[PDB]
Each structure stands twice: as C-alpha cells, then as structure tokens.
Amino acid sequence: RYNGLPSMEILGQAAPGKSTGEAMELMEQLASKLPTGVGYDWTGMSYQ
Amino acid sequence: DGTMTQEDISDYVAANMKDAISRTSGVGDVQLFGSQYAMRIWMNPNEL
C-alpha cells in the first residue's frame, strides 16, 4: 500500500545515453493509457 | 448528474479523499461534514 491505497512498486532505470528526467516522462505517458481507476506516483529517489 | 445522493457523496469523500487530505503538508485536522458508509443491520423486534 502507498499513501493508504493499494499499490505495486515498480523499479527500473533509463537506457544508456538517456536522462532519468526523460525516462520518467515515458513511464508517465504509458501510465495514462492504463485501465480506469489506476493512477501512479513517484517515491524514494524519484520524489526528490 | 444526480446519480449519487447525500449518503453516496459523504462516503466517497470519507473513503477516497479524507485520509490523503488529512496527511497533506499543513493540514492539522479534517472534520468530515457527513459520515463514511457502514454495514447497517436494521433489526426488527417483531421478526426477532
């Protein structure tokens, strides 16, 4: 559970010669095409 | 749209909105103007 709601932690990283910033943007894009009632958030290192 | 009644609106606020708002930066206390749903067993003295 994350911030009181059911969640599933997904780790990962950007490919070589790619920024963390631009890797995260893609994850966000993909995450908007997911089924209804499903959101996301950034935690740990991605939050800061 | 007039699908959710006063009861339904109060539940969704208590279930989905209240807890996250109460843990938000600067929010000291959150007074719910309504009540969260509960399993109401409305008993009958004649049938008992």
Side-chain angles (χ1 to χ4, degrees):
Chain A
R1 300 180 74 85
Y2 193 75
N3 281 345
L5 300 189
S7 70
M8 275 166 199
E9 188 170 6
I10 293 159
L11 309 174
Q13 53 182 125
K18 288 268 151 287
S19 68
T20 310
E22 78 185 313
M24 287 179 177
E25 306 190 354
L26 180 55
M27 284 293 299
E28 278 171 6
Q29 281 171 46
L30 293 165
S32 62
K33 319 314 231 184
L34 297 181
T36 315
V38 176
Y40 67 87
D41 211 338
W42 294 108
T43 187
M45 57 195 129
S46 310
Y47 178 93
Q48 293 177 334
Chain B
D1 69 333
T3 52
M4 300 177 71
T5 66
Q6 183 262 304
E7 298 298 319
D8 289 310
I9 297 158
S10 300
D11 176 56
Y12 191 89
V13 170
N16 297 259
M17 300 180 68
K18 190 184 170 185
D19 289 2
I21 292 286
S22 68
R23 285 193 288 276
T24 309
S25 180
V27 176
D29 190 48
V30 180
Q31 188 69 26
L32 180 66
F33 297 121
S35 186
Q36 194 181 238
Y37 272 148
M39 189 56 60
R40 303 306 304 197
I41 314 301
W42 298 118
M43 295 186 294
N44 196 305
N46 301 351
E47 293 182 313
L48 283 167

